Amino acid sequence: DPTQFEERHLKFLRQLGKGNFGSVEMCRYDPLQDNTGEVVAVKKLQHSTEEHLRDFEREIEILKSLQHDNIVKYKGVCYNLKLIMEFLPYGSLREYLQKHKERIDHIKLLQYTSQICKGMEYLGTKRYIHRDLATRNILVENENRVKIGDFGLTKVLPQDKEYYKVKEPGESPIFWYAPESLTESKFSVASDVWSFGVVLYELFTYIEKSKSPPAEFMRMIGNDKQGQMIVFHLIELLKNNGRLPRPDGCPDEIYMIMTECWNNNVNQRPSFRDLALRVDQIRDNMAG
Ligand SMILES: N#CCC(=O)N1CCC[C@@H](n2cnc3cnc4[nH]ccc4c32)C1
């Protein structure tokens, strides 16, 4: 029923991103062919396996079930299955921050952080595990609002368990992964909290390249480090309390929140509700 979009009326404008077996394009949906249609974002499989099709169908059903100010809006589907979403004109929070860092102060990062926590808490409410929290997957709707913007790796918890075990082919964002995701392939609300700690780290480094999680972890492990052993060495590092450093300029109270997200003890990480509470309290206090 979703105002199904006809493919012939979708006009390609440019690519927005890639995965991951996915890609997102900016298109103009122009059914009257008079150049008055709205611009939308279109996600499609970059190589349409039938297994990837199944995952994509599931991704679509997930986004469709989500309605929240901080979750990118589902608009419909076009079928060659394509997912149609609203286009957020500021693009990803990653690129936004890279290009506007002199305009975006700490209070503003905490506003975004708070919105990300609210979005994630809403997911947890549906027993959805995001599994890929990272600033390149957060979108900027306007200067005052961000949204979680991709759900390609999102899973629903089994009914009887608080974690979902999954091992995917090819490449993982290991430098955002909780220890138990690396060692046991276990993903849970708590591993999303671990990765949220890494998102907060990213925000406060202002996406400085030499400071990215991969660069810092690689540097702590040693870049004689030869790729298969990398995960093994990363595991050992985390187990011995190796951690991303406090970013330049970051207050101790904000770093403390990161470090608490990065607890090896899965059950000792903060909830997203407590995170929002704490972040909002630091905001109110930075007011004056
Ligand atoms: N496949 C895939 C990932 C991808 O292409 N991304 C990551 C998630 C955000 C994507 N993106 C980049 N700029 C965007 C603007 N609006 C968007 N609406 C939905 C997605 C979306 C936008 C890019």
Swiss-Prot record:
The gene is JAK2. It is linked to Chromosomal aberrations involving JAK2 are found in both chronic and acute forms of eosinophilic, lymphoblastic and myeloid leukemia. Translocation t(8;9)(p22;p24) with PCM1 links the protein kinase domain of JAK2 to the major portion of PCM1. Translocation t(9;12)(p24;p13) with ETV6. Budd-Chiari syndrome: A syndrome caused by obstruction of hepatic venous outflow involving either the hepatic veins or the terminal segment of the inferior vena cava. Obstructions are generally caused by thrombosis and lead to hepatic congestion and ischemic necrosis. Clinical manifestations observed in the majority of patients include hepatomegaly, right upper quadrant pain and abdominal ascites. The modification Phosphotyrosine is found at Y29, Y122, Y128, Y163, Y164. It is found in: Endomembrane system; Cytoplasm; Nucleus. Belongs to the protein kinase superfamily. Tyr protein kinase family. JAK subfamily. Possesses 2 protein kinase domains. The second one probably contains the catalytic domain, while the presence of slight differences suggest a different role for protein kinase 1. The lineage of its organism: Eukaryota, Metazoa, Chordata, Craniata, Vertebrata. Non-receptor tyrosine kinase involved in various processes such as cell growth, development, differentiation or histone modifications. Mediates essential signaling events in both innate and adaptive immunity. In the cytoplasm, plays a pivotal role in signal transduction via its association with type I receptors such as growth hormone (GHR), prolactin (PRLR), leptin (LEPR), erythropoietin (EPOR), thrombopoietin receptor (MPL/TPOR); or type II receptors including IFN-alpha, IFN-beta, IFN-gamma and multiple interleukins. It comes from Homo sapiens (Human). Ubiquitously expressed throughout most tissues. The chain holds residues 840 to 1132 of 1132 of the full protein. Changing K43E: Loss of ability to up-regulate potassium voltage-gated channel activity of KCNA3. ATP binds at L16, G17, K18, G19, N20, F21, G22, S23, V24, K43. Interacts with EPOR, LYN, SIRPA, SH2B1 and TEC. Interacts with IL23R. Interacts with SKB1. Interacts with STAM2. Interacts with IFNGR2 (via intracellular domain). Interacts with LEPR (Isoform B). Interacts with HSP90AB1; promotes functional activation in a heat shock-dependent manner. Interacts with STRA6. Interacts with RHEX; this interaction occurs in a erythropoietin (EPO)-dependent manner. Interacts with ASB2; the interaction targets JAK2 for Notch-induced proteasomal degradation. Interacts with MPL/TPOR. Residues 10-280 form the Protein kinase domain. Autophosphorylated, leading to regulate its activity. Autophosphorylation on Tyr-29, Tyr-122 and Tyr-128 in response to growth hormone (GH) are required for maximal kinase activity. Also phosphorylated by TEC. Phosphorylated on tyrosine residues in response to interferon gamma signaling. Phosphorylated on tyrosine residues in response to a signaling cascade that is activated by increased cellular retinol. This is Tyrosine-protein kinase JAK2. The active site is at D132.
